[PDB]
Amino acid sequence: ATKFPKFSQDLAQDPTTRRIWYAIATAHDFESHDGMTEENLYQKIFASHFGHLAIIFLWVSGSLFHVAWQGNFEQWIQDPLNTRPIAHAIWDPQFGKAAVDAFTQAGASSPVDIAYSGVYHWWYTIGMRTNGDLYQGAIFLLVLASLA
Amino acid sequence: ELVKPYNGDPFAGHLSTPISDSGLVKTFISNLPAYRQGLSPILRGLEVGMAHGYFLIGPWVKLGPLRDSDVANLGGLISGITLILLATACLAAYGLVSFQKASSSGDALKTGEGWSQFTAGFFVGAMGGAFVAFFLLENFAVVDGIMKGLFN
Amino acid sequence: ELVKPYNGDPFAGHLSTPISDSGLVKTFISNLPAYRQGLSPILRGLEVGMAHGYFLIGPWVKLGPLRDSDVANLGGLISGITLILLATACLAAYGLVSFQKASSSGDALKTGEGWSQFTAGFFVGAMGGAFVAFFLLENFAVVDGIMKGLFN
Amino acid sequence: AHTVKIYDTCIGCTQCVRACPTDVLEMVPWDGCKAGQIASSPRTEDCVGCKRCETACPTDFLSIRVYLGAETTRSMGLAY
Amino acid sequence: MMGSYAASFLPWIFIPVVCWLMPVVVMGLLFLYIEGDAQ
Amino acid sequence: MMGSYAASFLPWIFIPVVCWLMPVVVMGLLFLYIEGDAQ
Amino acid sequence: TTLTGQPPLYGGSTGGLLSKADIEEKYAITWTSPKEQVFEMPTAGAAVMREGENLVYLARKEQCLALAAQQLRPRKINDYKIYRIFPDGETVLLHPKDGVFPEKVNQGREAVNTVPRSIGQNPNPAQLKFSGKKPYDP
Amino acid sequence: IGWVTFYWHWKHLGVWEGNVAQFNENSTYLMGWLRDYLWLNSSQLINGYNPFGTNNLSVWAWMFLFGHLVWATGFMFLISWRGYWQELIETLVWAHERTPLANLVRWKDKPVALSIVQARLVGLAHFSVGYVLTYAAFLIASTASKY
Amino acid sequence: MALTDTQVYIALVIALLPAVLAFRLSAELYK
Amino acid sequence: AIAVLFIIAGHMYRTNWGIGHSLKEILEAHKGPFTGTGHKGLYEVLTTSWHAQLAINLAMMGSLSIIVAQHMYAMPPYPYLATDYPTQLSLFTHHMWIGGFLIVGGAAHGAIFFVRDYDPAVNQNNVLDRVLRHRDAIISHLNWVCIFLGFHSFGLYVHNDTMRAFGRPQDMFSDTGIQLQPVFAQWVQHLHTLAPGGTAPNAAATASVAFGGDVVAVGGKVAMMPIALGTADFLVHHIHAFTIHVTVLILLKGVLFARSSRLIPDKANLGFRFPCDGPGRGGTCQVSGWDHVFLGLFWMYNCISVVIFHFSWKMQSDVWGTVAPDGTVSHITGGNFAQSAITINGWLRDFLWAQASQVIGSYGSALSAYGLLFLGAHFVWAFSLMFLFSGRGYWQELIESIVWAHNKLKVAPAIQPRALSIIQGRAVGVAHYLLGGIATTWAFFLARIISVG
């Protein structure tokens, strides 16, 4: 047998490639795992819930950090109707010159993506005005995820 | 419970500490090429040499006497190449003096043949690592244009 | 009589044909460096790697993104080195997972130590072959003048 | 290995045993029906899980039940 | 492809890290984990 | 040493093949065969 | 053991044994035919069954039983025996284990994996939570 | 959800453009949905790259085609089922085990076809990814080339 | 203002702590 | 001359007066050192099995219908067919579809022969026995060549899509990038235009203008002109080779493994048409020869669809059009094939999106029925996927509840409603899929070439 998966000896003794595949699809079905009691079940669901909360927080932190670093938030404040919100920069070494020029948009110098999340409008309505407010939101969510 | 006797033995001159005995540190150290089980000594040597020779030329490339010239990479390479030559002479001298006694049937790096295989592997891997670091440093304009896509 | 059971076994899942069994093909395959008798695994890896590394950079040299530039051989060599690094990593990972079981007194290439020697030999041969291919390509003016007698 | 269970609605028609391609089932004496025999599965290690035995069963519901489980070389039917 | 943002040399290294080096390391380590023929 | 005749690159490869590669191959194969210390 | 028999006149096929035979296990079917006849191998193709005792190595038990069911039995050959062979060479008789075919009721056989109830009289999954209990448990 | 979002997007294209008559006239037959919504609004997404150059919609054109490819690749797992692929993989195993210089390398896990539930899942996941990426590319590029 | 290099470095160094925290959580959930 | 050679050819076989050959003598004569007893037993096989004859005759009729499609376009044998572009497109496309169907049917009845009429006693060390004895080598090598063709044709297409989207047109496989010139087809094209005074001296003109010549201009339109072959034609020809090879792979896997396999050693006892042998052995759905015919139908659809798409775009781009009185050819789509048929985006834009404008703008005009059938064929094709992606267990469980609702109102029928069988569900799905897709292409093709051509 193998070590993987630790939670299912039936899959662990499978000598085929199925041993990998089924394990990936049975990793989060904790109730079917070996040795699982109800107490360990609820505690593992608790810890997974916190890990998911931290992933959510890191995701918002990523959006905020990339808008503050590579975005055009302040220029978008000064003209919210005719400036395009920038999600993040583009680094694709397989780009030609025409794709570099084409994705050089929204008043930027380098290729960027145009944000379509609406995060700019939501942050503008709730009082955020500078890149410093976005940066402080990013670091605060970066420690909130650590707390989770 | 965090700090306990090393391998459960109270009189061994060691403490089982989470730096010294935790699971992460143990698997990381034991899977370094000098300790990775199953390897031939020459492959251990090759990996160790690659890792060392790659970074050896860097201090002279950025800080050596040739750093403010057209030939900084070349000076760093010559320095790293001869330093690896001394390192390999040190390794082979250690193997010559350290295993003239009897041979252990267990670990191969504790025998003269295995240490000479490690020495040969170290020399080949370290000269390769030094030259590949020199080659990337010299052709850094090409690598830079490749990563920016300037050649597209 | 050309197509018969393989090694005289009618139940084996093979057919002894003049592609699968003929003497020229048989001795050619057996005398390849993977199968040649009396070769230690390091020399097998050396020859195999030399052959593979020598031809590996060619597709990028004549077909890659740097083919229409001054640094075509450079980009081909860099891509070939990176592919060979991944190939050596694949070989060494295969050897780590495949031979963690006990050893055989038969082939050395079905042993973790022997496959590690083969892996190290492959790395050295393949980096060497890629580099000499780049070197001949980068100095094709000099080689061409050598064969044309332009230096006489 | 797969799990093959025989329930006491078995009427001993032997049809599951004849339909097994891997010789998992046999007819054993049993005073629980008119035929004087029940199906048995002593060789479920050779069960591939094909459920031909359930297809052949005439009782309603099935007197033979195959529960597919852990997969081996034998149960996945590999010749290699 | 060289932005006016702060620390513009960071995508140059981080894209090969997150795209080549980290997937190579993770794929290799997961390969060494899922094929361990231990108990 | 470059002719107006067709495919003039062919001597450039074939003379080292006929004079270096084929001889090394032939002497190596014959050296293995005539020193073959089997029955 | 020491499984004897002439192989049938078979030209060999790419569908025969693989490395699982020499490393993990193979199977054999032995029988006696009264005559040189033609049958079809499970590894595809026609084979000539010899007079007397024939021995065939196959990769799976299902191949041995398929040859027994579709070739030997319609030809009125019902003396076949099926074996499992391990790489060391140990040999286990498999198919006519007691000498009686499994479709025939034989004394001395014990009932295995029988359940003393009907099928939906099995317990619910809900009541059979964390424990070793399966709903098909005896 | 495709019907929901098709309806939303076509009505809002008519409302944002001010040509509400486009939807309020051609949404009653389904040739209007294919012609005046899908065929028309693809026109700038589709020319994201062309033989003459690239716009900023080139990534959306590429993702549009990518989504079509993933969605159609799911149809393979959904339509063709297991035993065909298992019989194919046995011949591939034979080809690997009888090929010189690749006999030295052996799989640690025996290659088998995807399970029935597994490839139902894999085909559904491909179908879903292709669905979502295709409609996202269409939505963003058809709403970004105008307003 | 636009972000400075030190703010990007500080963000990297600060996010290096949820790295080890997520690693510890995954190691404890593996156990 | 055809009449003379065919009345000649009807005199080779011995019937009643001792002159001619027994075909058995011919077959049993022909054998070699590789193929055992060669063709001994094929006379009995082909005189006792109607399926062994239906396989060959369907395969040859399909191949000949395909030949007819590729022959009646470049040498249009009827007056004013060459300038009837609707008729040219429709006749080519029709005979290709009939050919693909009959080829799939030949494979079907080959598998039916193998499961039902194969006697191994007749087929001892003949060609049939020995192909059964290395079917694994055959199928594995066909598998490899299919993967090779798929990568090195379609991967070239998506490489081109990615390079074009990158703004790297010099990195494309195009006539202006990395050229893939079809040199062998070009030289064979050259050899046919150097032959009406050379290797066919007693002949006025060439075989067809496609190989070379000048624009035959009947009426205002092109009758036929030279068809240039470049990187795009190289690409789509290798796409055709790939799709043909995969269709052959599926159908030959079905024919060769119809009797047995390593997975199922007794498929002959299960028959030609069976859904599976259960969820065991990992799962054995679609092992039957019927199911390989079922999959080969979709792959035939793919092959013929790409063939007729290539024909339509290449004719509208490089052959068909209007000849001006001064003598210049204004092609229908103006030669976009050489630069747009090298990416998938070009096929989606300049063929599928661009030429369907008439089939969707057809409403209110005489071609409005073609727009209606365009939509209805889309509907039938999507209707197929309900049968294709589902299984009958769900439908039987649902029919149980509808049966309950009928049982409450004393209207449950005596003939018990059942879900369709697994094979029938597959058959209904593939029938609706083929009908929907083929009718979609039919309505599109006819509306395009009638409104424009």
Ligand code: CLA
């Ligand atoms: C809070 C929400 C939530 C939670 C906690 C769960 C939790 C659970 N679900 Mg559930 N489910 C949910 C929502 C949720 N679900 C939703 C919204 C759906 C509809 C899709 C489902 C449908 C569903 C089914 C049918 C099943 C579960 C099952 C389970 C259990 C095990 C999951 C598992 O191990 O496999 C993990 C899953 C995977 C490893 C698959 C990963 C899928 C990937 C992310 C898809 C992405 C595709 C691709 C990578 C995208 C790339 C795009 C790129 C190329 C551009 C578990 C307790 C299973 C079970 O145990 O039943 C008893 C079960 O069969 N779920």
Ligand code: CLA
């Ligand atoms: C050959 C085709 C190709 C390739 C290889 C790429 C590659 C890339 N493009 Mg891209 N692009 C292409 C074509 C291509 N492009 C074309 C034709 C266009 C139109 C011109 C674009 C336009 C474009 C834009 C606008 C952008 C890119 C960007 C990028 C980069 C993404 C960085 C990243 O996070 O990777 C990581 C990949 C992921 C996170 C998604 C993969 C997730 C997989 C599917 C599932 C993984 C889940 C699983 C659990 C994990 C598996 C284990 C794993 C850890 C090993 C990447 C280098 C972006 C960039 O520059 O970076 C800042 C950018 O925004 N491209």
Ligand code: CLA
């Ligand atoms: C979690 C949200 C998130 C997402 C989706 C991204 C996405 C991206 N980042 Mg970013 N990053 C983030 C958070 C995020 N980042 C945070 C919080 C920081 C501050 C430390 C950074 C610092 C950063 C730098 C310096 C750079 C990027 C860059 C990039 C781009 C290229 C891919 C890459 O190299 O990543 C690199 C990632 C890091 C350097 C830091 C990673 C730390 C995050 C929190 C890890 C998240 C892991 C995730 C939760 C695990 C889920 C895995 C999933 C499969 C289950 C890409 C668009 C490059 C760019 O701008 O392209 C032009 C660039 O050089 N990022």
Ligand code: CLA
């Ligand atoms: C047998 C008569 C014969 C002789 C004496 C030569 C002699 C020569 N040829 Mg040659 N050649 C021949 C036949 C011959 N050729 C035929 C029939 C062809 C058509 C395929 C060629 C095509 C050819 C090319 C393309 C080239 C030469 C070249 C040359 C010159 C350099 C040596 C070399 O590389 O050859 C190369 C040999 C071949 C390409 C294959 C030779 C084929 C013949 C039939 C093999 C002869 C074997 C012989 C009979 C066996 C007897 C051996 C003996 C010891 C028992 C040399 C003067 C080179 C040149 O022109 O230099 C300026 C050059 O590149 N030849």
Ligand code: CLA
């Ligand atoms: C568009 C959807 C789609 C795709 C991509 C495929 C693809 C394939 N089919 Mg398939 N099929 C489909 C629909 C599809 N099918 C449907 C709807 C049915 C229902 C009837 C079938 C039924 C079917 C059967 C019965 C068979 C196939 C076979 C095949 C394989 C042919 C061999 C080949 O081309 O090699 C190459 C693969 C491609 C060209 C696919 C595109 C991949 C691109 C070009 C390369 C990707 C780049 C790289 C890998 C990306 C790396 C990213 C990394 C991070 C992972 C191939 C993988 C046959 C087979 O197995 O052949 C051996 C086989 O017999 N199919």
Ligand SMILES: CC1=C(/C=C/C(C)=C/C=C/C(C)=C/C=C/C=C(C)/C=C/C=C(C)/C=C/C2=C(C)CCCC2(C)C)C(C)(C)CCC1
């Ligand atoms: C992870 C980790 C870390 C870090 C580490 C480090 C420090 C790193 C690294 C690294 C390194 C240090 C790496 C390296 C490398 C290398 C390489 C990759 C090499 C190479 C080479 C080559 C490629 C060669 C080649 C050749 C030859 C052999 C011959 C011919 C010539 C040539 C040159 C071609 C930390 C601290 C966080 C902690 C612990 C863990």
Ligand SMILES: CC1=C(C/C=C(\C)CCC[C@H](C)CCC[C@H](C)CCCC(C)C)C(=O)c2ccccc2C1=O
């Ligand atoms: C094509 C196909 C196969 C063959 C497909 C196989 C064997 C899968 C092979 C996939 C290879 C290994 C490449 C996979 C690349 C993935 C994109 C990698 C993602 C994996 C994650 C774990 C990261 C089946 O086995 C099958 C089974 C049942 C019904 C339908 C089908 C079916 O349609």
Ligand SMILES: CC1=C(C/C=C(\C)CCC[C@H](C)CCC[C@H](C)CCCC(C)C)C(=O)c2ccccc2C1=O
């Ligand atoms: C929809 C569907 C069904 C249900 C389909 C059924 C039951 C077909 C029958 C439908 C028609 C409408 C039955 C017609 C009944 C009478 C003939 C009606 C009399 C006609 C008069 C009006 C003249 C399956 O049974 C099935 C089975 C396997 C895979 C997929 C599927 C599947 O997708």
Ligand code: SF4
């Ligand atoms: S088929 Fe059913 S009823 Fe007949 S013997 Fe088997 S289990 Fe009993």
Ligand code: SF4
């Ligand atoms: S599932 Fe198949 S192998 Fe198992 S007992 Fe039933 S018929 Fe026999």
Ligand code: SF4
């Ligand atoms: S899913 Fe259907 S076809 Fe596949 S094994 Fe089960 S019953 Fe047979």
Ligand SMILES: [Ca+2]
């Ligand atoms: Ca200086």
Ligand SMILES: [Ca+2]
């Ligand atoms: Ca370039």
